[model samples]
Target: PKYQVRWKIIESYTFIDPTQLPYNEKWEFPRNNLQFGKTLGAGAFGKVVEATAFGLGKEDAVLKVAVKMLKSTAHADEKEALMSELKIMSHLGQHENIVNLLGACTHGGPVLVITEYCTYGDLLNFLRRKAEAMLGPSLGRPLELRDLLHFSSQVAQGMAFLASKNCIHRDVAARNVLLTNGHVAKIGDFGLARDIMNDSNYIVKGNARLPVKWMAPESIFDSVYTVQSDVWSYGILLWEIFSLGLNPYPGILVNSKFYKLVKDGYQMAQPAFAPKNIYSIMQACWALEPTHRPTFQQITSFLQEQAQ
Candidate 1:
């Protein structure tokens, strides 16, 4: 079947319901399926739900839908950001490790985006939960280096796909990675992501906010972005994965240290868990010159080989 036909079939399984929702909340369901329930995450966008594909010619797969209801008193830019996210998601098709946008229902203020359900939730939460359990009364059970390498390779594969499409995932932090079925990591949150060379503007129309510590030196200084800049952020994410989701600059305020750090040729602090070879690759990505940063293909190869 054609891709669009497949998408329509997927869309048919989404339903929307808005009864008993909070004053600021709105609910939507797959048109063909009965409602299951909702979920929540820490992203700027609010109220992510997990709707089951029950009846209506559906299967066992559950859909994770994010419902963004424009607040009665929302900032003009916030609403614009939501709309821009829709445009970005529209252009973003399918990738094995990226969250798949199934469909959308925008009846009014609430714009519902249906995507693949991530049962374990975002990577940060997953890592934190695991870390807590490790340090719990049960004592420590550390993640093996091999396991970390596997997860990093999956991230690199997904990123290489995005880079091939000429898209830069500006925010490449732990919070944006979603885990499904324990080990499968899906890249989510495209609000700050955009086509690098194709667009004239530096930031998307409705979304100018970028994470400071996770940004590359060039991206932080001149507000310029490229796939290599994304690679820089990937190094930071590597740190996150190794440190069990600890921030690179844990105590530093984003606004105060960001510009100075870039100007001084500073890079993300290498965490203790990273292997020396992997750390070296991260250093290459955090090179003073963006041009010196390795390509996504190179990064992918490095991680894959390291995993092996």
Candidate 2:
């Protein structure tokens, strides 16, 4: 017998049966197929490894992937968090600007979430590398303003795809976005994602661990997250991108007083290199009223217009 788990069911389930999923057979990989390599990086409770996976793709070709596994001290909470991330990612489908989830390993031992590896890593580091190179380094071919717009447009397209799937990325920033070898920007990391089934608000109760600087006022105060809130974060990401990976909130320290400033309607000025038209787009994303902000689809179309 087979059964499909509902969206909310995933959040509460003690253990998810991968075989019950419609896409599970295609997504589950044999543990032996993965050959571990270099340690890419590590988070507080998890670690990512650059690995080679055999017998992947339609033609059974070898593939390079980033494998996410729990830290040795991780408990069930972190493990379940990673599993839920995999569940949420499975429904987003495919797009060039969205990082593709290759598969997962959950049959035994520690769970593994595998996805396509972006050669340049996160866009923040890439931009920082370029920023440092500006002072002059051996790094070949400097990044141009066109490249900034290119990354910006692709991120918009990626978020548009996520929006098309009715998903909201709570933490949308340059840090969570990645760059492929071809310089394509793909939205990655779904740890804070929640789909809008019908209504908009995905409110957090109690002490919320929110990204204050990139968050909307409603998100910071009411703890409500929606696609429009994501738009607010997108605006901040635009600031980071044009500033070459500079942190959000240039001078103002993030605190209780910060909300007072946000309520007072303070907005960032133009970046050192952002074209006038592009900064306009960021403004659209930063509308105080979520309803006033442009949808990712509209942003995508607007970006294409400026691509020329």
Candidate 3:
């Protein structure tokens, strides 16, 4: 069978009805079938664990997977957030540059979301290792300029797909991008993702946390988030790619003062090794006014041209 056909079949069984309180039976994974391995990483809500799940499709079907388990003592809102994340992933379906959801277990114990395991892990660590290798005669292959452009292009492509679906990934950053074998990048971690079909812009309520450095001026001052704000973040992600995992806004503290600096037009300097054309694309994404920022489609087109 072809890859897409197989994936379609797999997706059919992975979806859960969000309206249902506890998840449906079909989406539940047998706890016995999951054998936990070392911890991959953690977040505010829970930790991701490396695991092997048996009988994903058939009795003998086994697969290596990443199981993101919500903390057993999570609050109601946190649990609902995970379910929402699952719904978003299911709605987006299977995309080449988006992470794939295998299944979930929301009943009989703690909530667990099973996704395809990325052998190479998050892009930040991967780039940092590549940067370190450049400093010495390292065993691993060094990342070339083309590799950086390719990664940025792939991310833009993924975000363009999301934007077409009327969704906005509010937290677009290198830390949220995952890589599989052969350095194939995919966008993941949809904790802050929102559907913008009804409203193009989302207003943050109360005191929700925001990624200040990656946020746009409007978003920083007015708590507004949109596809354009995501474009702003993509520019920061591009900087991180070219800088090989360097932090954005080198000396700026993460506080209210940082907001004024951004509002005063503190754009990051062009990355040392970034090509003039690629750097130009970044500048376009960082336009002060949201309307002035190029759409992900435009960004992707420019990147594709540069990559050629």
The model with the greatest TM-score is: 2
What lDDT score is found at residue 118 in candidate 3?
A: 89
lDDT of 3 at 180: 88
What TM-score goes with each of the models? 0.74, 0.86, 0.84
- Model 3 earns a TM-score of 0.84
Q: Write the per-residue lDDT of candidate 1 for residues 117-217, one digit (tens) a residue.
A: 67777787678788888778766356689878877888888888777766767778777787777678888763312222232222232244346677787
Cα deviation of 112 in candidate 3 (Å)?
1.1
The candidate 1 region of ten consecutive residues with least summed lDDT is 1-10
- Deviation from native of the Cα of residue 52 in model 2, angstroms: 0.6
lDDT of 2 by residue, 1-308 (tens): 11121222222314335334344667899879999998766644667788999997778979899888877766666666677667767866789998888999988778898888998888988999888888774556788887888898899999998877667777788878989988999988634122222212222324434457888988787766777889999999999999998777776666667778886778888888899997998888888889999988888888777776
Please identify model 1 stretches exceeding 4 Å from their true place: 1-36, 42-45, 54-80, 107-109, 137-142, 190-209, 254-258
Candidate 3 Cα outliers beyond 4 Å, as residue runs: 1-26, 57-60, 190-206, 255-257
Clashing pairs in 2: none
lDDT value, residue 175 of candidate 1: 75
